[PDB]
């Protein structure tokens, strides 16, 4: 939904997207290693 955010919100909203991407890659890789075993 279209919204306008301040600088403080924006600098944060990048980070949770950052953390979530790291977790997904971390989770996916662990799944692959166990799957290979």
């Amino acid at each position: 939904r279209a919204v306008v955010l301040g600088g403080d919100e924006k600098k944060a909203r990048s980070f949770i997207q950052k953390v979530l991407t790291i977790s997904k890659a971390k989770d996916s890789k662990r799944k692959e290693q166990k799957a290979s075993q």
Binding site: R1, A2, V3, V4
Partner: protein
Amino acid sequence: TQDSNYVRTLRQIELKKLEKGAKQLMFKSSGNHTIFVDSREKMNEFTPEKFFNTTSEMVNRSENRLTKDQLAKESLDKKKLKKFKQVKQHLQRETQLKQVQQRMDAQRELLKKGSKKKWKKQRKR
């Protein structure tokens, strides 16, 4: 996707924010200056250096034309270009938010109950 209330509040942020942003900014004077003297011999001998008691450099700077007796950074100014345009971006946003509110406004009157032959004239009881 956004309603009249949400858009209205945002523009009110930027109008006040614009008001503060302009206030901090200085602004070089553009008014016109005249000097009144006594006699025509006093005319032809007049020069800005004498009357102001300043050097040629300081005559141009009207804001702080220090008397000569009193006289006896690209990144820094680039950030100044950022400050002035920063107020400009708010100015652009405010009119942009104004347009959507106007368009949101107009649709609500079209939805409003009326004759609408352009509104035909019918004293609302």
